[PDB]
């Protein structure tokens, strides 16, 4: 599964991953700015909140 990643939350990357579900993030009160990205499903820092999805580079 490809997906986006970047833990840079400016410029954007992705990587390869085994999972087949990813995840982006976005800062809590900024719902319109996905922030960072990952795979799988949620992992992050207040105040970033995640919502996964599944499918190549869904976590757009």
Not at 2 to 25: D, F, G
Not at 42 to 49: E, F, G, K, L, V
Request: glycine share 4%; charged share 25%; proline share 5%.
């Amino acid at each position: 599964r490809i997906c986006y990643s970047h833990k840079a939350s400016l410029p954007r990357a992705t990587k390869t991953c085994v999972e087949n579900t990813c995840y982006k993030m976005f800062i809590r009160t900024h719902r319109e700015y996905i922030s960072e990205r990952g795979c799988g499903c949620p992992t992050a820092m207040w105040p970033y909140q995640t919502e996964c999805c599944k499918g190549d580079r869904c976590n757009k």
